[PDB]
């Protein structure tokens, strides 16, 4: 086969840096290596074909090189919209195998999260389950700790977190923390609070609501 | 007088895969077309200011056409699609290489697909080897039997020289002069 | 413009069959080779199959064996992939790709890709998503920016699509990646930050679409 090994598997660089991605082949593929870019939740897009030919519409800051083995993709000036995953794919011999991929991340100035808490809807309560959502919006760095307190009682194990991929426009993250309780347990309490800690925050930020108010 | 005008002032050049060679011997070499040069000039193994004082047995004039990004491969100890699969120079190459931008001659508005170049080949070319074979290249495990399909492609492709392309994709006419009883003085 | 759109994805039990389609427009479909490419959740792209313009050349990756069958209808500008004996490792989003290089040369690249269709192989059941509003409280918005959203809970399989005001509202929207709950279902929240002044005058509706279950739900998000 034609195993395609990319290095690095992940990298972090800032806007304006010069990023170089390496792609190696198990055997000689001449000069028919192709580069692709894929955003989270989007379709891949062709960047370089035939090792060095730039696809129409792709900015000139993208450039490819190499012959035989050890192909390289170079981004001369990294822009905010280049955050994605870059795959190399050999076309010398079937199957047109792809590389493992190189995820490029961008770093930025510290931005504290804006916190929002949402009570469960009356519609959901009618069905036996209560979900309480806490939103950490447009923050950097990614690290944050969410602690649920119900009538001033720290919860444990009854929460799940989900984090967006680093935004392509402002290089920030968003995080959702969902507290799942039974309708019976939810209606036993009045106070539901979401406490958020972040390295950009000097003090923890607590958003709370009173049940039924 | 050695026929140097017929090689440089030629109206039509050959493709790089089928490069033409003019065997020049038993003549007086009026070094003036290469002696002084939008003309690139790379010499290997010999000095041009000493060419008028040297007699050679045979002088070979190789002419073809490539694009700008491929002129760097027409040199000893070079690799690439042109060097490995079209026109290779030996490591001890004794001679000079001449190349100039011919975008006003070999590029049409609708594309000049006349010039061709070899893509696939099972092995690399030996120095001064010309392969004009057009057999369907077998890349996979199944035979081709003259069938153009998956893993069985045409070993030749077109350049499609258009004047609106970048300098790296514009046609460049290359003239490689090899210096081998000594009669070419 | 050039365009490809995949269809036919959905739930299928292990061992059963599913037929995918790819509709092409904006280019001469009959002149180009087409490809099927899939992607495992979290993994990288994986080439599946290709077919020449006149169907004289047809290929499958080894993980396909004799289960899948690629075909095309040049008169209908359509590419097809008949998937049989589907396994759990066939769960992936399937892309349909057009080859750049014209005619019998498939050694360059796929310039045009569809949005893809999701195939999920599981011995489960097609559950629809419940949509609940994420309304802000009366005394809980401390800024000139307010947040609202929609909880899309307990669906199977992936994916779901959430739009705001039928696609008219895109700025500030964050549709979180799904999470697999202990029950076995998926759930995600889609939020949007809007001017707090707009809460009294403007209408915000989230539009949730779950193609495997043909679920379409509109939910107006209003203050409580």
Author numbering:
A (entry chain L): 1 to 213
B (entry chain E): 335 to 371, 374 to 516, 521 to 525
C (entry chain H): 1 to 224
Question: What text does the study give?
Answer:
We have determined structures for five mAbs within the neck/left shoulder cluster: Omi-2, -9, -12, −25, and −42. Some broadly neutralize all VoC, while others are sensitive to the mutations at residue 417 and 484 found in Beta and Gamma (explained for Omi-25 in Figure S4A).
Following attachment, cleavage of S releases S1, allowing a major conformational change in S2, exposing a hydrophobic loop that executes fusion of viral and host cell membranes, releasing the viral genome to initiate viral replication (Walls et al., 2017). In-depth structure-and-function analyses of 27 potent RBD-binding mAbs isolated from vaccinated volunteers following breakthrough Omicron-BA.1 infection reveals that they are focused in two main clusters within the RBD, with potent right-shoulder antibodies showing increased prevalence. In summary, we have presented a structure-function analysis of potent human antibodies induced by Omicron BA.1 breakthrough infection in SARS-CoV-2 vaccinated individuals.
